[model samples]
Target chain A: SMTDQAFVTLTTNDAYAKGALVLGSSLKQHRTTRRLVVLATPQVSDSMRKVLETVFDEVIMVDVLDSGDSAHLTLMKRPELGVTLTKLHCWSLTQYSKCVFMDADTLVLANIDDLFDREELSAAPDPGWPDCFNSGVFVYQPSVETYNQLLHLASEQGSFDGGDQGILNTFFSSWATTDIRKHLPFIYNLSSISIYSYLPAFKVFGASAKVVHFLGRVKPWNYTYDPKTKSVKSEAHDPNMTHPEFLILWWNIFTTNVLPLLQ
Target chain B: SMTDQAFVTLTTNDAYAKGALVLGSSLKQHRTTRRLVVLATPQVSDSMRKVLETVFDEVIMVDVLDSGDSAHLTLMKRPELGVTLTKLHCWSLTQYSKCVFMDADTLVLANIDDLFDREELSAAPDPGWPDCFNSGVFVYQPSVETYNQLLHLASEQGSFDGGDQGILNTFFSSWATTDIRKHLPFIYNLSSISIYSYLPAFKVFGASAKVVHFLGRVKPWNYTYDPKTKSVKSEAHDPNMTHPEFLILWWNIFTTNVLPLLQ
Candidate 1:
């Protein structure tokens, strides 16, 4: 039964592949009993794919050029949402009865097998707006029917934010006011925005954080790590990386475990 | 009985008393089956009191100077939250088994009598943060125990935002993730911030708005009304008053009904 469930991540490019590698490594380090899976796009390089394959049990390649008619029709209307459509493919993995989807940019700090115990459509709230889930981390059940329905909805309604989060939030419209159990604790997908936006709340609950999401344009790969000092250097003064400890931890995982595989 | 429940409001000063009068008149206009009650402070002028008396079935005077020993003890630690303590006095109206407490600055668009069916702590989400309900409008059960517990919590915790909202949110911490029934729809207590923050959503759902909360330093009374044109004029460019129709409605009610009582 544990083998029938998975921790899923997606990476559309070689840059995000690096994030996937670190995320998978972190999951392994935490010793998750469930299987680790990743969805990669064709754009990801062969070398990065090999690196991802070593950490992730199933590094499935998803292609936008080779999709079903319904998905192609949906993407034809909204080409910019190609990756969003690719994300919908997670639902087609019916082999896994249930799955926890985490964005490639998220790093696990603890054994989160308890997340698998949660029902489908359970996710942590977005720091920007608590009413909407961040979509960085979520628990979902795989069903081909649900996937087609999502594609159909995407074709008709499109997305408000023109991203996967918007489409997912719209599909799960009742998540906000229907059931509170479906709402995951913020610590499950603690975003960078909370570090500075609401420093007080972060200070109170930062230590208990189970997962950290590098949610904006910047990723762990975006920063430079110095081996001598064991520190991360930013190109600019970025508020998102204010808690250098998390960044350093990301780099530590990257350099110690992920870097050798890449080499 | 319908008489056992009441619509409650609080006015710390004459300025807010004007808001209370307009709110009371709007409720009466909507033909609420329940009774109307207003809690006024000593600062509310004698003339304004009479005007409030004309519309409100009961104009109870709540003196901050003459509160219970526990309230006085709590007020000493957090002196800035004097008005917040006055708001807490709503729980003391134990005569009414259930009361819907509306901020003085809120207006009723339709007969929200259905709110009586809801349980205690049912309120609309704040536009600023959806997780925290706006204190502007809420359905609450009156209990001396809850009032004392809240006062004790206020004495110890103070407020995160140094207001009733922060204190209430803190006291009702489980509200966000406990029960969905407790979460009222946004239409119930829509604020001005929604007008600009998410204009697209406002355009779609704005018409269904049940209660309008003029929540900010500027209120309807601050706007100048031209009786001939039947319009409201603001001193400067204020985004909060973007929907002047609501302001016009407030002025129309004041001039047609409330102004006569004031004179």
Candidate 2:
């Protein structure tokens, strides 16, 4: 028998809040059986809260900071700990038996119910390094105990990549090669960056891809992704920005699907 | 040079009424841009018609067989087309510049709009035989002349697989050795049967799969696929009965997504 399960996302800023809304809407769009939960920091605007309420089953408030002295300070630090620290709150969702966490920037293309079958500490390899799992997406066992443990660990050892990726890889140190099943294939958390490295394989089996992670700073929101600009491709090589198929999909969902809810 | 496209399916009787609903809903569930159409035989019950009308953009009528006559209906699976001669009507829908036809028995797992970019007669190779594309799913260009040509070709040569598959293959004979672009990999139309061939492959790459073809006689509706039946393993040795994760997902979509409208 199955138990209560959830699809969770986190956003510490209003920009990432848009990402979270699209994330929740995309999960519902696929008719997922799991509950949709959003963990948002207080820094997100009240306007964004209204949109999140409509799309997510639960819009949780977590304490963290990006709402600071000035735009310059926010940009200089840019919610690094605020984002990483608030992410630990997902472990406190003990009511749910298991949780699959998606970064607000990731776009889902399929019903990933199978994720529940996997135990905690499961995630795909990051585009930059295989040994390091991307915090952009991961499955975890939620417990108040685990939550506090993560907080204590964070105090002693902060995230090395300046975000959740470092904290999680270190916390779940055994994830890299301990068990094959714990290691999600790159396709599960496919990055727009990695497609260039394995373009041939991507072209062949790309249609079957389950998720696309806009892991870097630039997002689909930064690009114009409507019908007219549909043909435009992301230049992953240039290093400035890289838009891929998911960006257009994200835009399409926002316009045709998500925006209607505001009315 | 291009125009609108659609995802099409067939319902020769009320038996497939449920399949058509899930196929359409699943396509929509994944947020597909293409229209959803059902080419149904008049034999479909009025009650079934009500359900389809709510779900499909077009509930198209085509002459197949009278309900009074069983029309050689056999309780068989494995996707041979000999029994489904009426499916040839798919070609007549010239309204769409292109269409992807999914056997009512197929279950889509992803947004497959990229299919529209390919030229006509693109399909996954049948698992039993690589040379012959499975008629269960394929992308085709639609035109009045093309429809008439397909009918005429059927009259002259008949289908090679003995159902729409034979007729269609005979009409699009060059699929096997022609431009590889015209051929979709088996990954796109993965059959439930193939999972047993290499459980390891299905375990690893299965998460990225775009579609799952029930491809067998006992449709998911036939099985009692709840939590108890879900964990029941597929006795891969037995051809008589099987239950697996895909079947669980199929049941999940039906119960959670489709039946809600009826309630």
For model 2, name the residue pairs that clash. Answer: A234-A243, B81-B163, B159-B166, B159-B167, B160-B166, B161-B166
For model 1, the stretches where C-alpha displacement exceeds 4 angstroms are A64-82, A105-109, A125-134, A191-207, A212-263, B18-22, B65-82, B125-132, B191-207, B214-263
Cα lDDT tens digits, model 2, A36-79, are: 88998778888888789898888999887221223222322334
TM-score of each: 0.77, 0.47
The alpha-carbon deviation from the true structure for residue A231 of candidate 2, after best TM-score superposition, in angstroms, is: 5.7
- Cα RMSD (Å) between model 2 and the true structure? 22.6
Residues B175-240, model 1: lDDT tens digits:
777778887877777777665444434544578889888876678898878988987766664656
What is the lDDT, from 0 to 100, of the residue A123 in candidate 1?
A: 91
Per-residue lDDT of A103-157 in model 1, one digit per residue for the tens? Answer: 9889999989999778989997664345567788999999988999988887787
The candidates' interface RMSDs, in order, read 7.5, 19.1
lDDT per model vs. reference: 0.78, 0.69
| Shift of residue B85 alpha carbon in model 1, Å | 3.4
